[PDB]
Amino acid sequence: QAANPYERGPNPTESMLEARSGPFSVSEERASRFGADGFGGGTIYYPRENNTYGAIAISPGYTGTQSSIAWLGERIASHGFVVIAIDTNTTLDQPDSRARQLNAALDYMLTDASSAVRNRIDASRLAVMGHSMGGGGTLRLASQRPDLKAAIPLTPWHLNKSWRDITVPTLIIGAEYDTIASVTLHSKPFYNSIPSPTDKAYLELDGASHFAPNITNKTIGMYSVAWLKRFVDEDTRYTQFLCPGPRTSDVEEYRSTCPF
Ligand SMILES: [Ca+2]
């Protein structure tokens, strides 16, 4: 019974979560393609403030690179996270290969990055996120690693529909007008398959394309950070944004196991 030891930054408001950056100024360190084993390298974003934070790996999708998710990895790092936006070994890698590479990237932050990075990581509080096939990779890694603290598949694609063994808090963000990873064949079937008691939520962005995750988006930003705050940091000051959650508005649909 004490102040949460993982709490970082001020008491949140909607406007703070919708803004382009959080309260921590951030610096970058390259994970070189010439120095990364098991994935294609990346950019680590980390808070300049010397404290420990949660560590998060983020995969792009098919034909995508670290630059299509960089805004999100930066935005999230600036709320007090060490985040790596990766490149994949090839841009054509499939979901389950991306799951292995999200796994290699966490190992990287933890063992291979510079002292400044490693010193800011609480190695026991990790999370993954992914766009489309990166999103399928996130589900797979979440399924193989019950020890992760959260998983956030964004407009996810995967041929396997059944994610029955996931026990890691998972927010699946869907895009209502996605023409590539339709919520009806991908996001909803994945979400529908995760059984109680796993915490989870499904948010479907109103009016949004498959590519909404590759452009600065306050709804993806606010809800991704609330989710990582609530589950990587156990930070209950963020539950108020997720429960009861968005009226369905910027949001086509919201389902959740609130209050978690
Ligand atoms: Ca609508």
Side-chain angles (χ1 to χ4, degrees), residues 38-40 86-90 93 97-105:
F39 64 113
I86 70 165
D87 291 310
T88 57
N89 292 324
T90 78
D93 293 343
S97 162
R98 296 170 193 274
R100 283 191 315 273
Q101 292 180 241
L102 275 167
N103 190 63

Side-chain angles (χ1 to χ4, degrees), residues 176-177 204-207 249 251-252:
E176 173 178 13
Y177 293 142
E204 186 175 310
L205 299 165
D206 181 86
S249 171
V251 178
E252 173 61 22

